[PDB]
Amino acid sequence: KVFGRCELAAAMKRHGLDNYRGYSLGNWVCAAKFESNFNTQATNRNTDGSTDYGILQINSRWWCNDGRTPGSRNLCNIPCSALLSSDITASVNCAKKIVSDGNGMNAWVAWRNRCKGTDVQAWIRGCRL
Ligand SMILES: [Cl-]
Ligand SMILES: [Co+2]
């Protein structure tokens, strides 16, 4: 599923991401935009052999099991394919573990490089939340 911006913002709010660990909703929408272009089916292979999955490009080295990443820790205890669902629940639940791990949203390189320090409120402007 390719979400609309406001549609995604609303789904994220319902799943409790607004101000989760102090990160306002716009941060999460901005991260999803640049990681996946709001497409739940996005996959991208990394240089280390791991793969990133779904709307928030969650990695198979640490977070989910794709059966082809040796030494994967699967800390979200899920198959990576679960993260490609039109239902974002699994992605959101795993993202909450990731942002809690100590580096906050810096765990998402796209967020650090393209969202951090910008007017992220723009990402939810106009939306009926
Ligand atoms: Cl933080
Ligand atoms: Co990535």
Swiss-Prot record:
Disulfide bonds join 6-127, 30-115, 64-80, 76-94. Its EC number is 3.2.1.17. Its main location: secreted. In the egg white and polymorphonuclear leukocytes. PROSITE patterns: GLYCOSYL_HYDROL_F22_1 (PS00128), GLYCOSYL_HYDROL_F22_2 (PS51348). The keyword Ribosomal protein does not apply. One of its GO terms (cellular component) is cytoplasm. Keywords: Allergen, Antimicrobial, Bacteriolytic enzyme, Disulfide bond, Glycosidase, Hydrolase, Secreted, Signal. GO terms for biological process: cell wall macromolecule catabolic process; defense response to bacterium; defense response to Gram-negative bacterium; defense response to Gram-positive bacterium; killing of cells of another organism. GO terms for molecular function: beta-N-acetylglucosaminidase activity; identical protein binding; lysozyme activity. It is found in: Secreted. It catalyses: Hydrolysis of (1->4)-beta-linkages between N-acetylmuramic acid and N-acetyl-D-glucosamine residues in a peptidoglycan and between N-acetyl-D-glucosamine residues in chitodextrins. Residues 1-129 form the C-type lysozyme domain. InterPro entries: Glyco_hydro_22, Glyco_hydro_22_CS, Glyco_hydro_22_lys, Lysozyme-like_dom_sf. Substrate binds at residue 101. Pfam families: Lys. The active site is at 35, 52. Monomer. Lysozymes have primarily a bacteriolytic function; those in tissues and body fluids are associated with the monocyte-macrophage system and enhance the activity of immunoagents. Has bacteriolytic activity against M.luteus. PANTHER family: LYSOZYME C. Lysozyme C is capable of both hydrolysis and transglycosylation; it also shows a slight esterase activity. It acts rapidly on both peptide-substituted and unsubstituted peptidoglycan, and slowly on chitin oligosaccharides. Belongs to the glycosyl hydrolase 22 family. This is Lysozyme C. It comes from Gallus gallus (Chicken).
